[PDB]
Amino acid sequence: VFLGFLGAAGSTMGAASMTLTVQARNLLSGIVQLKLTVWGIKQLQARVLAVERYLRDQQLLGIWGCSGKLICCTNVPWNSSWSNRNLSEIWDNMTWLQWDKEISNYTQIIYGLLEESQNQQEKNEQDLLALD
Amino acid sequence: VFLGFLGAAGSTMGAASMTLTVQARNLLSGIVQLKLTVWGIKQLQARVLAVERYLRDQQLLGIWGCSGKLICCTNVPWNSSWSNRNLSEIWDNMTWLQWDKEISNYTQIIYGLLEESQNQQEKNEQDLLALD
Amino acid sequence: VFLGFLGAAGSTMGAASMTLTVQARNLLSGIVQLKLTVWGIKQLQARVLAVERYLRDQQLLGIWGCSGKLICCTNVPWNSSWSNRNLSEIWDNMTWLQWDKEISNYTQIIYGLLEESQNQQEKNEQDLLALD
Amino acid sequence: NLWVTVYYGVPVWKDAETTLFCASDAKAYETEKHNVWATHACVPTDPNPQEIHLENVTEEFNMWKNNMVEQMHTDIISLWDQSLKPCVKLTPLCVTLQCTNVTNNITDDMRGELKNCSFNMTTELRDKKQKVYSLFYRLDVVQINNKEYRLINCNTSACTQACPKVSFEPIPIHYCAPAGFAILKCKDKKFNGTGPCPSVSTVQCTHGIKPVVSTQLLLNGSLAEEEVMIRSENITNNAKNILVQFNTPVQINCTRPNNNTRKSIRIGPGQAFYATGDIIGDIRQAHCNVSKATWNETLGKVVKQLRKHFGNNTIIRFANSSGGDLEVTTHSFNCGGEFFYCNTSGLFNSTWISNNDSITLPCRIKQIINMWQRIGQCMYAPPIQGVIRCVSNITGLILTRDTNSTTETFRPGGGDMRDNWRSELYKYKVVKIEPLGVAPTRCKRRV
Amino acid sequence: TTELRDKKQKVYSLFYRLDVVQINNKEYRLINCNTSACTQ
């Protein structure tokens, strides 16, 4: 069922995952459509910042070997120190906003392993499988 | 054989598909290379509009799980109401311009299912195949 | 070991390949963060040129069926006329700068086959494998 | 057999020019005072500027083709103009002046130098005028045909009053390159002006460089290591010039002992003009104080270098300029908004063979000046109220090379202020990174 | 008027009768001055 932009924002993370694309589209949006003038360089600046805003994180997903995004798995195990809750305590009983409230503390820390571990090791390995 | 930009424009859709890349390159083109001044914000505006023009549709191909574009298949069946012709009546006897002349009537309608159906269902499914 | 931006620049091509991502990130960089004024359209112009500079070549990697870049193989054989050296004479005894010094002579020539051969043939073929 | 393998993030680059942009700490923005200099609209610097020495990396440095200088030069010029446009134009000052000598303490040591003129000037009351007076240096005015005089600028172009709020204090500016471009910096204490550097590093951005405008003498620059540095595009070619960088700061202390007032006159409508009030206090000519033994010592160190590029049996003489345009003839510099012109004959007068004490340098004050040899416009300095005195570090020389088998004569020059920027930016160069590369590798790629 | 903002200077010049018009030797006027300003 089509809900609308951010229509699942007020639901559990499990439920919300159903309709991530409905949001995804408008994360970059597009369209929009005497010189200078007020707004003359503001629509300019804003529309630029939108593009940068998008790609800055998209590239990270490019690095984190997935690309086929919205959702993908890794080979990095979850450290229990990063909010030790059960799946039903998390996915079936918590919104994404509530999730960030806690996990935001380890953002860069988790990014470290995502930015690396697998990306490093998945490769080499493959080159070695290409030996024969 | 290299024909040139839009060199196959005057041929059947089947024939034209041979050299889609020759066109693809120049869809975004690139290169190009007292303040303000006429042209001062026109080359600016134009070059911007080129980038937007491109990505606006490229993102759609990103959503429509293909990415490896120019050509890809889907799991959406063709509704016979959308110009009921035979393949030889279409692909071997019609240009792309002639094609659009008709099919343009159902553009957004077809986009509906492309934007969705498969993109929705292909997934979930996979997550379920990941159960074991 | 984290070396830093261009930290492996002064090493053999084999060694340097270890840490291509450390460079990759800052190839586009991002961040950065009375009207007009000096710098008023210079930061503008520069930041634009950065985006173009990036994508112009990124699209080529899009065309050259890889996308998962930094490194990928092709089905184009190396012509011996393009600096006939051994692997140990190349990869274990030469920097990237030294490499370009020679191979730069055949840049567009090699691009020809990269831009084409495989991209052309890999496809069609697949469509034919889809027959059944 | 080997195959074509694609690599990305390759540490290579080509010498290339792009558009640089500034950076300026965060305390420099706290000086406020309605935008001092052309800087406010500038990205704050990082609290931790990064660098990295690069081992095994060597390459060429060419300060004489370094286009960083050209950009900086024209950028500073642009800033200058932008800071003046919103200020008061002095077009209605272009009138016949009725002037007379000023009876300084008899008999006459000061030589006057200023004339107390008077004339009927327009005011806000657009109906009736009023007679006013003001002081002007005889370097600013010229006799027409008491006697009649004229503001010198009026025969060449209009003149604009610099705002009383804006200052001219040089502020350290950092330059940064956009992503994909690198700032390279050699740390080699030795440098001929061009060639390979055994010790190359790289930085995010450049060190703070103050945009100090001066001729002949270089002020508040950076210091050289080891010995005195001699750099020239072509030492043997006397159509070129010589850059000398010092090892030790040479103190110079310059003073204007005149507690003068500012009889501002409301030459509206609305806009106000700052005329010269009265001059009181220690009526002495402005001058500079130089430590003589220090000058002699350093000069000697310079001559040592010269010996090293001309021979162990030649004679070195120092003299003043060829004369001509005051701007080139004398040493010009800004202190606190005031423009000084000093007779450096007191410095550049020596000689060396084959193998306190202090110096007083007479100076003059001008109020109408022309920047960067540019004609077509001029700027009026407002008189600065009170006694003006300051001190700075002489950090280098702009020298020129003058029956050629022994004695050679050298003298101070300047004019082209790109020289000043280049005297610092020689430590830097900009290159364009090329992330994409390929190489032969034993690998055949499967489906 | 010249640069010397004080005294004028009697000068002369030629103008086509297509450019000027009689007011009311005789008095004439630059035709543009009844419609707008003019730039060299």
Short mmCIF file of N, CA, C and O in Angstrom, two decimals, chain C residues 6-10 13 16-17 19-21 23-24 26-30 37-39 42-43 46 50 69-74 76 78 87 90-91 96-97 99, chain D residues 2-13 19-21 41 43 52 55-57 75 78-79 178-181 435-445:
data_model
loop_
_atom_site.label_atom_id
_atom_site.label_comp_id
_atom_site.label_asym_id
_atom_site.label_seq_id
_atom_site.Cartn_x
_atom_site.Cartn_y
_atom_site.Cartn_z
N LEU C 6 47.68 9.93 -0.87
CA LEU C 6 48.82 9.76 -1.78
C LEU C 6 50.04 9.19 -1.06
O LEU C 6 51.16 9.34 -1.53
N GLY C 7 49.80 8.54 0.08
CA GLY C 7 50.87 8.03 0.91
C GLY C 7 51.72 6.94 0.26
O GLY C 7 52.85 6.69 0.68
N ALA C 8 51.16 6.29 -0.76
CA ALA C 8 51.88 5.23 -1.46
C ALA C 8 52.40 5.70 -2.82
O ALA C 8 52.88 4.90 -3.61
N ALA C 9 52.30 7.00 -3.07
CA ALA C 9 52.68 7.56 -4.36
C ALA C 9 54.11 7.20 -4.71
O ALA C 9 54.44 6.99 -5.89
N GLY C 10 54.97 7.13 -3.70
CA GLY C 10 56.37 6.82 -3.91
C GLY C 10 56.66 5.35 -3.67
O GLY C 10 57.53 5.00 -2.88
N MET C 13 53.93 0.03 -8.39
CA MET C 13 52.52 -0.01 -8.75
C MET C 13 51.80 -1.12 -8.00
O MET C 13 50.64 -0.97 -7.60
N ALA C 16 51.42 0.16 -4.43
CA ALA C 16 50.49 1.28 -4.38
C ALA C 16 49.04 0.82 -4.44
O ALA C 16 48.15 1.45 -3.86
N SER C 17 48.80 -0.29 -5.14
CA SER C 17 47.45 -0.78 -5.35
C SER C 17 46.79 -1.17 -4.03
O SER C 17 45.57 -1.32 -3.96
N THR C 19 46.38 0.52 -1.38
CA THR C 19 45.66 1.60 -0.71
C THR C 19 45.13 2.62 -1.71
O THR C 19 45.36 3.82 -1.57
N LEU C 20 44.41 2.14 -2.73
CA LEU C 20 43.82 3.03 -3.73
C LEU C 20 42.64 3.82 -3.19
O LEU C 20 42.38 4.94 -3.63
N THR C 21 41.93 3.24 -2.22
CA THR C 21 40.75 3.89 -1.65
C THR C 21 41.10 5.15 -0.87
O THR C 21 40.41 6.16 -0.96
N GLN C 23 43.17 7.24 -1.52
CA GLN C 23 43.18 8.30 -2.51
C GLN C 23 41.78 8.57 -3.05
O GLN C 23 41.37 9.72 -3.20
N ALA C 24 41.04 7.50 -3.33
CA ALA C 24 39.77 7.60 -4.03
C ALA C 24 38.84 8.59 -3.33
O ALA C 24 38.18 9.40 -3.99
N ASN C 26 39.26 11.29 -1.71
CA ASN C 26 39.54 12.72 -1.83
C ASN C 26 39.68 13.17 -3.27
O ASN C 26 40.06 14.31 -3.54
N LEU C 27 39.28 12.30 -4.20
CA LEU C 27 39.31 12.62 -5.60
C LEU C 27 38.10 13.52 -5.82
O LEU C 27 38.09 14.36 -6.72
N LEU C 28 37.07 13.34 -4.98
CA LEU C 28 35.91 14.22 -5.02
C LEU C 28 35.74 14.95 -3.69
O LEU C 28 35.19 16.05 -3.64
N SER C 29 36.19 14.32 -2.61
CA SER C 29 36.42 15.05 -1.37
C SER C 29 35.09 15.38 -0.71
O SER C 29 34.70 14.76 0.28
N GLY C 30 34.39 16.37 -1.26
CA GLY C 30 33.14 16.79 -0.67
C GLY C 30 33.43 17.73 0.48
O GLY C 30 34.50 18.34 0.55
N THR C 37 31.39 39.28 -4.93
CA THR C 37 32.61 39.41 -4.17
C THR C 37 33.62 38.43 -4.73
O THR C 37 33.24 37.43 -5.33
N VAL C 38 34.91 38.71 -4.55
CA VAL C 38 35.94 37.78 -5.00
C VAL C 38 35.75 36.49 -4.24
O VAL C 38 35.40 36.52 -3.06
N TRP C 39 35.95 35.36 -4.90
CA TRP C 39 35.74 34.08 -4.24
C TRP C 39 34.26 33.74 -4.37
O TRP C 39 33.88 32.58 -4.29
N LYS C 42 34.13 31.80 -7.40
CA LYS C 42 35.38 31.13 -7.70
C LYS C 42 35.23 29.81 -6.96
O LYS C 42 35.54 28.75 -7.50
N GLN C 43 34.72 29.88 -5.73
CA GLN C 43 34.48 28.69 -4.91
C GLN C 43 33.38 28.06 -5.73
O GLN C 43 33.39 26.85 -5.95
N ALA C 46 35.01 26.40 -8.93
CA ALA C 46 35.93 25.34 -8.58
C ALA C 46 35.20 24.07 -8.14
O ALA C 46 35.52 22.97 -8.58
N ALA C 50 35.18 20.36 -9.92
CA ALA C 50 35.45 19.12 -9.19
C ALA C 50 34.45 18.02 -9.53
O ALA C 50 34.84 16.89 -9.81
N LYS C 69 34.82 -0.44 -9.12
CA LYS C 69 36.09 0.00 -9.67
C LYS C 69 37.26 -0.11 -8.69
O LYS C 69 37.31 -1.03 -7.86
N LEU C 70 38.20 0.82 -8.82
CA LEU C 70 39.58 0.65 -8.37
C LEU C 70 40.33 -0.40 -9.18
O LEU C 70 41.44 -0.13 -9.67
N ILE C 71 39.75 -1.58 -9.33
CA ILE C 71 40.35 -2.62 -10.17
C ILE C 71 39.31 -3.59 -10.72
O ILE C 71 38.40 -4.01 -10.02
N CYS C 72 39.47 -3.94 -12.00
CA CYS C 72 38.64 -4.95 -12.65
C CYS C 72 39.35 -5.45 -13.90
O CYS C 72 40.19 -4.76 -14.47
N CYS C 73 39.02 -6.67 -14.32
CA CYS C 73 39.62 -7.25 -15.51
C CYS C 73 38.77 -7.00 -16.74
O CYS C 73 37.61 -6.59 -16.63
N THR C 74 39.34 -7.25 -17.91
CA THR C 74 38.59 -7.17 -19.17
C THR C 74 38.81 -8.44 -19.98
O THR C 74 39.49 -9.36 -19.54
N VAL C 76 40.08 -7.89 -23.13
CA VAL C 76 40.95 -7.33 -24.16
C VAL C 76 42.41 -7.69 -23.90
O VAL C 76 42.96 -7.33 -22.86
N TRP C 78 46.52 -7.66 -24.19
CA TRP C 78 47.49 -6.57 -24.26
C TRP C 78 48.38 -6.71 -25.48
O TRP C 78 49.04 -7.73 -25.68
N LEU C 87 56.40 -8.65 -16.14
CA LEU C 87 55.63 -8.25 -14.98
C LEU C 87 56.49 -7.77 -13.82
O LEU C 87 56.18 -6.78 -13.16
N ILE C 90 57.76 -4.50 -14.67
CA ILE C 90 56.71 -3.52 -14.52
C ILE C 90 56.23 -3.37 -13.07
O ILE C 90 56.58 -2.40 -12.39
N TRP C 91 55.42 -4.32 -12.62
CA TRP C 91 54.77 -4.25 -11.31
C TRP C 91 55.65 -4.23 -10.06
O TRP C 91 55.30 -3.61 -9.06
N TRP C 96 53.72 4.29 -10.62
CA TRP C 96 52.64 4.64 -11.53
C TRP C 96 53.01 5.83 -12.42
O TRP C 96 52.62 5.88 -13.59
N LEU C 97 53.76 6.77 -11.86
CA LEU C 97 54.20 7.94 -12.61
C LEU C 97 55.14 7.53 -13.74
O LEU C 97 55.02 8.01 -14.86
N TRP C 99 55.20 4.58 -15.06
CA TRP C 99 54.35 3.83 -15.99
C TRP C 99 53.71 4.74 -17.03
O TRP C 99 53.83 4.50 -18.23
N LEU D 2 50.49 -11.81 -19.48
CA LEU D 2 49.97 -10.71 -18.68
C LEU D 2 48.78 -10.00 -19.32
O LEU D 2 48.64 -9.96 -20.54
N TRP D 3 47.91 -9.45 -18.48
CA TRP D 3 46.64 -8.88 -18.91
C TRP D 3 46.53 -7.44 -18.44
O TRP D 3 47.27 -7.02 -17.55
N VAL D 4 45.61 -6.69 -19.03
CA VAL D 4 45.38 -5.31 -18.60
C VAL D 4 44.53 -5.26 -17.33
O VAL D 4 43.38 -5.67 -17.32
N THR D 5 45.14 -4.76 -16.25
CA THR D 5 44.45 -4.62 -14.97
C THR D 5 44.24 -3.15 -14.64
O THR D 5 45.14 -2.33 -14.82
N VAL D 6 43.04 -2.83 -14.17
CA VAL D 6 42.68 -1.44 -13.93
C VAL D 6 42.83 -1.07 -12.46
O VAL D 6 42.40 -1.81 -11.57
N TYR D 7 43.47 0.07 -12.21
CA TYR D 7 43.74 0.53 -10.86
C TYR D 7 43.18 1.93 -10.65
O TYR D 7 43.12 2.72 -11.58
N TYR D 8 42.77 2.23 -9.42
CA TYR D 8 42.23 3.54 -9.09
C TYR D 8 42.69 4.00 -7.72
O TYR D 8 42.79 3.21 -6.78
N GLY D 9 42.98 5.30 -7.61
CA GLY D 9 43.61 5.84 -6.42
C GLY D 9 45.12 5.86 -6.54
O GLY D 9 45.83 5.83 -5.53
N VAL D 10 45.62 5.90 -7.77
CA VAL D 10 47.05 5.84 -8.02
C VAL D 10 47.72 7.16 -7.65
O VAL D 10 47.29 8.23 -8.08
N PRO D 11 48.77 7.09 -6.82
CA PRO D 11 49.46 8.28 -6.33
C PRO D 11 50.35 8.93 -7.40
O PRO D 11 51.57 8.88 -7.29
N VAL D 12 49.73 9.51 -8.42
CA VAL D 12 50.46 10.23 -9.45
C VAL D 12 49.79 11.56 -9.77
O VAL D 12 48.63 11.77 -9.45
N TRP D 13 50.54 12.46 -10.42
CA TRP D 13 50.04 13.80 -10.67
C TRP D 13 50.78 14.48 -11.81
O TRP D 13 51.91 14.11 -12.14
N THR D 19 42.00 26.96 -9.98
CA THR D 19 41.55 28.11 -9.21
C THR D 19 41.70 27.86 -7.72
O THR D 19 40.97 27.06 -7.13
N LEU D 20 42.66 28.54 -7.10
CA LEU D 20 42.89 28.43 -5.66
C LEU D 20 41.92 29.31 -4.88
O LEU D 20 41.37 30.27 -5.43
N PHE D 21 41.71 28.98 -3.61
CA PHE D 21 40.84 29.79 -2.77
C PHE D 21 41.45 29.94 -1.38
O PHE D 21 42.29 29.13 -0.96
N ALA D 41 35.00 37.16 4.02
CA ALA D 41 34.34 36.19 3.17
C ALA D 41 35.39 35.15 2.81
O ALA D 41 35.86 35.10 1.67
N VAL D 43 36.92 31.01 4.11
CA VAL D 43 36.73 29.84 4.95
C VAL D 43 37.78 29.77 6.05
O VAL D 43 38.98 29.87 5.78
N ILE D 52 52.80 15.91 5.42
CA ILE D 52 53.47 14.61 5.38
C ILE D 52 54.61 14.60 4.37
O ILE D 52 54.46 15.07 3.24
N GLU D 55 59.07 10.50 1.63
CA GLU D 55 60.34 9.81 1.46
C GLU D 55 60.43 9.15 0.09
O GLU D 55 59.46 8.54 -0.37
N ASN D 56 61.57 9.31 -0.57
CA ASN D 56 61.81 8.80 -1.92
C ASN D 56 61.11 9.60 -3.03
O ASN D 56 61.29 9.31 -4.21
N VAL D 57 60.33 10.59 -2.64
CA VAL D 57 59.69 11.46 -3.63
C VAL D 57 60.46 12.75 -3.87
O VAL D 57 60.55 13.61 -2.99
N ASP D 75 44.00 38.74 -7.52
CA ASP D 75 43.00 38.60 -6.47
C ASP D 75 43.11 39.73 -5.45
O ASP D 75 42.10 40.31 -5.05
N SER D 78 41.75 42.84 -6.98
CA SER D 78 40.29 42.81 -7.01
C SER D 78 39.72 43.21 -5.66
O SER D 78 38.78 44.00 -5.57
N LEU D 79 40.31 42.65 -4.60
CA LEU D 79 39.91 42.95 -3.23
C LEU D 79 39.99 44.45 -2.97
O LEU D 79 39.06 45.06 -2.44
N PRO D 178 41.41 22.77 -4.52
CA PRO D 178 40.23 21.89 -4.51
C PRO D 178 40.59 20.42 -4.66
O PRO D 178 41.68 20.09 -5.12
N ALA D 179 39.66 19.54 -4.26
CA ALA D 179 39.90 18.11 -4.29
C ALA D 179 40.37 17.65 -5.67
O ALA D 179 39.82 18.06 -6.69
N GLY D 180 41.38 16.79 -5.69
CA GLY D 180 41.97 16.34 -6.93
C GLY D 180 43.27 17.06 -7.21
O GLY D 180 44.06 16.65 -8.06
N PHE D 181 43.50 18.15 -6.49
CA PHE D 181 44.74 18.90 -6.59
C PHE D 181 45.47 18.90 -5.25
O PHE D 181 44.85 18.90 -4.19
N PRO D 435 43.83 9.81 -10.54
CA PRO D 435 43.48 8.56 -9.84
C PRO D 435 43.53 7.31 -10.71
O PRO D 435 43.83 6.23 -10.19
N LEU D 436 43.26 7.44 -12.00
CA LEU D 436 43.08 6.27 -12.85
C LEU D 436 44.39 5.86 -13.51
O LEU D 436 45.09 6.68 -14.11
N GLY D 437 44.73 4.57 -13.38
CA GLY D 437 45.90 4.02 -14.03
C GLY D 437 45.70 2.55 -14.35
O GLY D 437 44.78 1.92 -13.83
N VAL D 438 46.55 2.01 -15.21
CA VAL D 438 46.50 0.60 -15.55
C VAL D 438 47.90 -0.01 -15.54
O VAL D 438 48.90 0.71 -15.62
N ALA D 439 47.97 -1.33 -15.44
CA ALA D 439 49.25 -2.02 -15.39
C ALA D 439 49.08 -3.51 -15.73
O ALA D 439 47.98 -4.06 -15.58
N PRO D 440 50.14 -4.11 -16.25
CA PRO D 440 50.14 -5.52 -16.59
C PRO D 440 50.18 -6.42 -15.37
O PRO D 440 51.08 -6.29 -14.53
N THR D 441 49.22 -7.32 -15.27
CA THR D 441 49.17 -8.26 -14.16
C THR D 441 48.70 -9.63 -14.63
O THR D 441 47.81 -9.75 -15.47
N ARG D 442 49.31 -10.65 -14.06
CA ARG D 442 48.99 -12.04 -14.38
C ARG D 442 47.55 -12.27 -13.85
O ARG D 442 47.38 -12.55 -12.66
N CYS D 443 46.52 -12.13 -14.70
CA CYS D 443 45.14 -12.35 -14.27
C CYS D 443 44.18 -12.43 -15.46
O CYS D 443 44.10 -11.51 -16.26
N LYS D 444 43.46 -13.54 -15.55
CA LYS D 444 42.44 -13.72 -16.57
C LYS D 444 41.05 -13.72 -15.95
O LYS D 444 40.53 -14.76 -15.55
N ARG D 445 40.24 -12.64 -16.04
CA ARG D 445 38.89 -12.52 -15.34
C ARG D 445 37.61 -13.43 -15.71
O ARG D 445 36.97 -13.15 -16.73
#
